[PDB]
Design a protein around this ligand. Structure first.
Ligand SMILES: Nc1nc2c(ncn2[C@@H]2O[C@H](COP(=O)(O)O)[C@@H](O)[C@H]2O)c(=O)[nH]1
Length: 194
């Protein structure tokens, strides 16, 4: 489906701000934006909600839907499978809202190969050291997973400066400042939706 407004792809390292900032945007501008609820095979963290943060399913279940052609894209990340189902994006487009997707670098490249034509925004930590401190606070990962995640985060930070990859790269040192910059990047789309 190409109808409805242009979507928005948010990326950057997990834990560096993209998810928190998106939740804030969806609260302030709930009539304008809708979130694409990805499927994942990883286990839920405390406070996450099925059908809101992710559809939490097993590998077997996700594999059946993949085999059926139900996904726009999918990726392996730190031992688990993640993906954007067709229906997740279509549900938001049907409400005539701006669909926001939160994906890793592989998902950015996956979506670049589709016909969705989104705006791409990367949310970066001030440093890998700061990101590591934040990840170890909630401590939701095994050490093996944290090692894979920190390597992926480093690769993400290195690719963030690639010419033409992202429309805007936001450095999240302060959530209030980064949130202002997220809306700045979307300000024309927000005004047109209004
Ligand atoms: N390619 C892709 N990545 C996703 C999807 N959903 C979440 N991710 C990404 O997977 C990484 C790990 O997410 P986390 O396990 O920390 O929630 C993050 O970069 C997140 O944006 C998806 O549908 N597709």
């Amino acid at each position: 489906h190409m109808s409805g407004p242009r979507p928005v792809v948010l990326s950057g390292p997990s834990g560096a701000g993209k998810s928190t900032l998106l939740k804030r945007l969806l609260q302030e501008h709930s009539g304008i934006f809708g979130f694409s609820v990805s499927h994942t095979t990883r286990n839920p963290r405390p406070g996450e909600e099925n059908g809101k943060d992710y559809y939490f399913v097993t590998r077997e279940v996700m594999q059946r839907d993949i085999a059926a052609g139900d996904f726009i894209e999918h990726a392996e990340f730190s031992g688990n499978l993640y993906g954007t189902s067709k229906v997740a994006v279509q549900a938001v487009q049907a409400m005539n809202r701006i669909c926001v997707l939160d994906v890793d670098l592989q998902g950015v490249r996956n979506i670049k190969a589709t016909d969705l034509r989104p705006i791409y925004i990367s949310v970066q930590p001030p440093s890998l050291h700061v990101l590591e401190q934040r990840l170890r606070q909630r401590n939701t990962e095994t050490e093996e997973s944290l090692v894979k995640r920190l390597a992926a985060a480093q690769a993400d930070m290195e690719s963030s400066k690639e010419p033409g990859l992202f429309d805007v790269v936001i450095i999240n040192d302060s959530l209030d400042q980064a949130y202002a910059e997220l809306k700045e990047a979307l300000s024309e789309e927000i005004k047109k939706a209004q």
